Amino acid sequence: AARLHRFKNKGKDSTEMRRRRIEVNVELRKAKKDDQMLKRRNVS
Amino acid sequence: MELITILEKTVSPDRLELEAAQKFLERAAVENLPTFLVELSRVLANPGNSQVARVAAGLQIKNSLTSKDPDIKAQYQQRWLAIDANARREVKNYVLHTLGTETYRPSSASQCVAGIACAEIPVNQWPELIPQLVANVTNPNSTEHMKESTLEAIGYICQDIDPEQLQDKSNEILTAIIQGMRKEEPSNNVKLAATNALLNSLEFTKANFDKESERHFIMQVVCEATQCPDTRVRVAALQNLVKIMSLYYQYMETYMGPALFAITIEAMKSDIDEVALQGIEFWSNVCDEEMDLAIEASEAAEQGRPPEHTSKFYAKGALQYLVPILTQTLTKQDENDDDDDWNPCKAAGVCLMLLATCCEDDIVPHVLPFIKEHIKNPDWRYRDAAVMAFGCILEGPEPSQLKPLVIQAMPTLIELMKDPSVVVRDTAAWTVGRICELLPEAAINDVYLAPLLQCLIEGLSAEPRVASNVCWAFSSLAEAAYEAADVADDQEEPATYCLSSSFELIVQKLLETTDRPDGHQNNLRSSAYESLMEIVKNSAKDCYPAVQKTTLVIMERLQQVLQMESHIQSTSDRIQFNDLQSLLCATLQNVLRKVQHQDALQISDVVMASLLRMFQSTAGSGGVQEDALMAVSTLVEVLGGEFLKYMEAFKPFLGIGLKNYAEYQVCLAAVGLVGDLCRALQSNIIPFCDEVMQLLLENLGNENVHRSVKPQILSVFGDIALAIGGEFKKYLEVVLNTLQQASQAQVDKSDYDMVDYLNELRESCLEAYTGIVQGLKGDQENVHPDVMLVQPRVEFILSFIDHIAGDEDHTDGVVACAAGLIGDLCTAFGKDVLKLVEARPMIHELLTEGRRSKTNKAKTLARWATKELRKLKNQA
Questions:
Q1: Which of B58, B119, B374, B717 is the Cys-Cys partner for B386 at CB 3.0 to 4.6 Å?
Q2: Which cysteines form disulfides (chain B)?
Q3: What domain range is A43 assigned to?
């Protein structure tokens, strides 16, 4: 029942920033992998 | 000694005396648990014993049955179930017979009942429990303590057992709870307990809520309880209304108009914080439920069908009355601000942002007038509320409608950046940050950009409270500036952008802000570093000079750290030291992806060593390890095959990371690093594979590890196969069996915490097969020899994918990867695969679904796979 993390920039602490950092990486791995497979198969 | 005498010693403020007593207890449990459990219960059940001994006795029991570690809890439960049913009975009687006999407030027996029940109930091993608690509560001659205790016990049971297993006892349990909540109950304490027990039990009361008879009965007792004089019952009953609103939104139209509206609105107006927060929460929750429903409606719309549930737009209809109430509450700030405290003021701000994203444009005409009337008010409380309210409505309304209102408001906003009140400056900084993020054109203007920058640059010197928001404002201004510049540069990054003229000034200031001695307040230092990372990343090419200078600065500070184990005095010193470590690595992760592949080569060696030592000595705190490993991945990405030079010295650290398993995020980083090493080193990673594979297999065969690691490992398996190709035949059998077992996985089609987890373990399997299939097929000519090894498994893969097409859970992510697999299978086995695909119909609709999907990749691959299957038909 507490949404402090939604108040201004309170929710942007270190745990949350690390979590986002990992998100950017995981999605960045896909782009590399998805684009590498797409060039093996020969598609759009 | 005497057991009671030992129990009383567990409260001695003497370390050795506690140890002596604690050890005596631990070994009595080891020697004969059943008898130990029996003798403690006897102590707990006797009113003649001292308060101290009884409470201590209850503590020893609870700690024998439950734990915080789900793995240890399960172990204690079965250990308890293994006990002679004659022994357990004795304890159950003594424990249940204790209810009501305690003078001690928080009942010690309550926890025991729950501890035991959590083990017995799921196996109808204690059929006398429920009827007794019910009896205890309902009996008109039961004492207050008797009632409170029992209600407490019911509450512990509902909070600790899987709702899935009390679903058949919900009936009797609600009877006991509602009886305790009735208005005519003398004790407010009994009322409190019953009402808290109700909150814990709503999860398994779906069947009851479906009967209007019982529904009405529950809703009346609760609404009635929010009218109780004891503020504690008021608040708990309010909380029940919030959770009921979530769980049973669909049944609420009966009670909204006639009562919920009045109750919740009246609560928001309470001067009692506890109460005001519950009323505000109720509506923030309605907003959340309705925004989800709006998504369900929007989604169903594209599938050409009606949604499973429909909103009643309660927020839109309450909007008129909530806003005046919400904006006035923004007026209740706490001058002496504690940024870890949740009060009505903060809650009103958030509720306002929710109503805005929920009711979009409808809110503006209700909020602007309060903003206009008070933006110039001499009372800072009102001036602040006006800027806050303004910043709160920036997301949701149509940008075309806001832009003008934000343009005409810039002059006053800039003025507000220099307001004498700190509170006001704090808000104005956040509001500027939100404009840069949502309505950038109003900031990246030839009129306001300049005075805005000077205000933000000066703000970095202000109190932490202000400078922090200024850091975030800058980070979002940098993003908007980058986007507005490379809109069309015909190449990668833009040549320049509006922040170029003062890029050096900004980076210099952020670096200064980073070393402020008060940087620990309001997460200033972190924000300053996070803001610098975003400014560097989102920079124009002509800013590369300052970026190089900046990178040199980062490396320097990087070492100042390695040699900073001196100052670490108090425990908080070891923590803030760790933080810095992370920030620097994270800031490294950013520079490396911005530097010329040539620049990154001179830094590589010096940094690899810095990341090398930072891991060894600093074994404590995985957060550092996580950013240290992520930094390493970042380096590996830049260097490439060149990274090989270090692999020999980094092997041990790579292992450690994989062994950890106790800190899932440090292990997820390790696994993530393994995979990068594959795309980098390629076949050159063959020698290090036995180790990693051995370690990866162990992690999987260790059910204690956080479930979020398994799919990452499965995924990396597909990458390792691609990296070593044929040399993978060495692990094929093991991996396919593992993949075979994981692919059969399945949770409950209700728990969305799993329904989204299965689509993560599924995509990883598909991605593992795809990798394996591609790895063994070589690189060019017809299907290579190796892939034939997998030929016999082709059948299940298709079945797996077939079942996936079934469960209407999916995810455009799963659909895409499956489609890519069908395709690669057609290219690996040929004509055969066709007979197997037209057999499993569900695969045809899945590919069909892909062809639709607004996920370009889901389309591309589904469109591609279809083309491939089509070619097999028209082949032989």
A1: B374
A2: none
A3: 1-44
